[PDB]
Structure 1
């Protein structure tokens, strides 16, 4: 990621974290509402916080691997697919936007957009490996 992105990411986590409940809450209603096909895969409260937590170590993502790895098994067990990553991201960024309000500036959203992507790639790679190794 570009420093500014990384910079905005480090700067906004707190504001983000301060608004978790809502973000999370709005996040789930919207996820289930607009994407009925995933409803079967499923509540999990720590989605937003997990992302925020990863975002914070965005300069040392390896640090989060132990947790990233506990979660992967669950994901693989539930049929999570790399293709689901984008709709979770879309709903997340929407909640983020919805809750920032005015601070939800363009470049802020964009950077969060970049961040989730990178973040998603760790789970998305680990699970691939998990599915690959499931034989």
Structure 2
């Protein structure tokens, strides 16, 4: 997840916080209208102090903030790559070669699911590093 991405997530979260109570009511009312069967899981007076919307939003945001902080190490790695002469345009071919090599080495135990997981993991990490390359790239 890139810095640009977490920034726009945080900004939209702040927008909801600004209208927190209104947003929370809207969430409950929509939830119970689309799926009345979950209504009994909540207090009869749940609108008065329940915070379902924020419970979910805050968990997401707090988790993403932890992941973003951890990715500072990847940004440090990218800065080293700048110094190695590596450019943002080089990341796709390394990724393709990574998957090509894994497919070869794992053989008949390689699966579409594995290919997807490794592809998504590489692509996400590469996107963080590419974002850093762009900042130093003169």
TM-score, normalised via structure 2 length: 0.46
Q: Greater helix percent: which structure?
A: 2
